[PDB]
Amino acid sequence: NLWVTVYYGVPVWKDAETTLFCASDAHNVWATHCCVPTDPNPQEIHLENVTEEFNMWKNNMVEQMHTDIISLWDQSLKPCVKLTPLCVTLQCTNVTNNITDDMRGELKNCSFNMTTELRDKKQKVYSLFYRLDVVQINNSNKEYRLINCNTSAITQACPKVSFEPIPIHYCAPAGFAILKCKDKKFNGTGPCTNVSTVQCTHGIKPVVSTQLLLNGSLAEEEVIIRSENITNNAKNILVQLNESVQINCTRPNNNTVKSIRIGPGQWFYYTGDIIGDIRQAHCNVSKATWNETLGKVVKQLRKHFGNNTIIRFANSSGGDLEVTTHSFNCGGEFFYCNTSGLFNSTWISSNDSITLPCRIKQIINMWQRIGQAMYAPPIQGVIRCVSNITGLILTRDGGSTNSTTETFRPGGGDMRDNWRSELYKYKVVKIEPLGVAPTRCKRRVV
């Protein structure tokens, strides 16, 4: 004795994939792009008697971060000076004045022919290189070419443009909603009961780095390790710390940047002169802090691998610097730090900071993509920055020896895996307001 009753405005949803847009709270690329203002009201609604399943490894928002970040990057670089006319035979010599023994021939003094405003005139330019950007022509030790002359055209970045990451808030389009998990112990891939609605995410700062994750959210309560298919050594491990570690980085030398005209309406920037004893770049971390932090990580993985294990750390496998070193941007310059000193220990059940030497590059490929190149003009003076280590990417060697000793190394990964961390908290669903139910009424018919 029941009929169909129809309702519109039913508070339900289904998992869905849509396009999100960004906003911020105000030269910067991020600011230019995410020009849409934010709403100061958190608009977060706790739901009672709610459960939801959050699988961060299937979170499409991670892909969106990647897609749109790259897109912005490309748009920002596009309207700038092409350095194509300069990928020419270069004459070089090694620098022998005010050089420490750590540097030796890493820094080179080169000279070459350059164009001028009139096509009929040519000038001669002198500049400095860090070796990593320059290779031998074919082997003569006077003649060199830029590393990219056989692969891609290089565009210099416009010096007025700021890439400093800012927190960015992502907001749902009408018809969609964002759900958030606040379960402090949630490890991803699964149900969460501390569920609330979200209109816009918190501000996520798009920091790009490799082996160590800087300036992200810090874990609440305890160090937590998140991974999928954990016994499979093909997967990496994302570790989120609940205490930050301070790292002090520097580019110690005084760089006098010079610029010249290259063609109508266009300037070229280069290194000019360097003042003071020349040293490589460095990053400092307290050794005690690092050891305490690491021990905490070890305890968490120990519960995952067994009470009787030995946790051994080792440095990374060989390969490109973007894989083997801690690659990050500091002060606008690109650093490649040797992290092997952070992994030389085995764990068995004043600060004396560990200092990592770091290389600097002027020719930058980007996003693990090739066929494009960017030239990073030098920055005048001396550079320092201080960053917060909030998490790590690690891999396990795997294999079966059953020795109880597991080996962990700096992990490699995608930029997507950095963003994956912040986004573990959010899911996108579509609102479905229409539905039916049984009833004792029947439409009145007259």
Partner: protein
């Protein structure tokens, strides 16, 4: 409650929250225009939201509900869809749970609603003539 405040509520408990859900379905500049791919994606998103909205409104019209949020029809409830107590459903099941309970019957119910309304309008036309 607010938008979806009632999502964890039971079916009867969520009565009268229908209005918030309905209200929330519908809602620098030089960058938005210059970045062509950006502008297209955002415009498409708004267009899609509209298209979605219209399909639901079209159906309510087709079934004879139109502008109402709460409708009752001449189509019977089937044992092939569910066999649960009416109070179990209305007092204890969550609307989200309910959708899980009724799965892959949508197109059946809609076909029945559409045909029933079609015949009802014809009957009215004959009576007036």
């Amino acid at each position: 409650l607010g938008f979806l405040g009632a999502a964890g509520s039971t079916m009867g408990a969520a009565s009268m929250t229908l209005t918030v859900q309905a209200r929330n379905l519908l809602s620098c500049q030089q960058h938005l225009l210059k970045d062509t791919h950006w502008g297209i994606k955002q415009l498409q998103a708004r267009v899609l939201a509209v298209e979605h909205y219209l399909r639901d409104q079209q159906l309510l019209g087709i079934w004879g509900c139109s502008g109402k949020l709460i409708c009752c029809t001449n189509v019977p409830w089937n044992s092939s869809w569910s066999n649960r107590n009416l109070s179990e459903i209305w007092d204890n099941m969550t609307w989200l749970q309910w959708d899980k309970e009724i799965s892959n019957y949508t197109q059946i119910i809609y076909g029945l609603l559409e045909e029933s309304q079609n015949q009802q309008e014809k009957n009215e036309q004959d009576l007036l003539e």
